[PDB]
Ligand binder design. Structure first.
Ligand SMILES: CS(=O)(=O)c1ccc(CN2CCN(c3cn[nH]c3-c3cc(Cl)c(O)cc3O)CC2)cc1
Length: 208
């Protein structure tokens, strides 16, 4: 079964500011998770320049956007390097304490939540729109895991035995009842187009 972990003080701290703040431009969250995957594929590509059998676990590199109007999920899947268990636990490979500090000195002092990726913690903008995030990751040398949180200042990590994926990371947004517009064809295209045009990797928008 299913170990539970506390979010460090500062990361729990952040999250509640995200959940709680009145802030209207919630759409940046997709910019942020895109930029993250974009960062992970970069890492496996560099990694393959020296050892070309790292790409043994699926050799094409892309971001898929999969809306599901039925389960209220939107899922942003990539074939990037992936996280090991160790990573997942470390705020999903982010600097977080370090990062959040900078963020809030920049926050309380004239600058909005949209600059959150400039501090290395874009992931959490997920909670602008999601009431529960599930994160699926496989990385070559480890096995596959599921990280999950609905905030509340904790998170699960199970080793997951649903889908094999060879490599990369699946971020499932189980979206808030009133944010169903992010399952919309029109809206996701608008957003992926105005905020992630020059992401150097093919972004496929799935249709339903
Ligand atoms: C492109 S960036 O704006 O320069 C940037 C760079 C690095 C990060 C930090 N993070 C480190 C570990 N990362 C990683 C490694 N394996 N898998 C991931 C990964 C993580 C998340 Cl949270 C995600 O949504 C997708 C991923 O592929 C990438 C993102 C965030 C933004």
């Amino acid at each position: 079964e299913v170990e539970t972990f506390a979010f460090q003080a500062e990361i729990a701290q952040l999250m509640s500011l995200i959940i709680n703040t009145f802030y209207s431009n919630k759409e940046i969250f997709l910019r942020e998770l895109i930029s993250n995957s974009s960062d992970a594929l970069d890492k496996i590509r560099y990694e393959t320049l020296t050892d070309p059998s790292k790409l043994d676990s699926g050799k094409e590199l892309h971001i898929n956007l999969i809306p599901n109007k039925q389960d209220r999920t939107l899922t942003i899947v990539d074939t990037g390097i992936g996280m090991t268990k160790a990573d997942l636990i470390n705020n999903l490979g982010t600097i977080a304490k370090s990062g959040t500090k900078a963020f809030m000195e920049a926050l309380q002092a004239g600058a909005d939540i949209s600059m959150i990726g400039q501090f290395g913690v874009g992931f959490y903008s997920a909670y602008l729109v999601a009431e529960k995030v599930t994160v699926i990751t496989k990385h070559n040398d480890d096995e596959q895991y599921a990280w999950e949180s609905s905030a509340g200042g904790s998170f699960t990590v199970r080793t997951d035995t649903g889908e094999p994926m060879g490599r990369g990371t699946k971020v499932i947004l189980h979206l808030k009842e009133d944010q169903t517009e992010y399952l919309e064809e029109r809206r996701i295209k608008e957003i992926v187009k105005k905020h992630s045009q020059f992401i150097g990797y093919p972004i496929t928008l799935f249709v339903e």
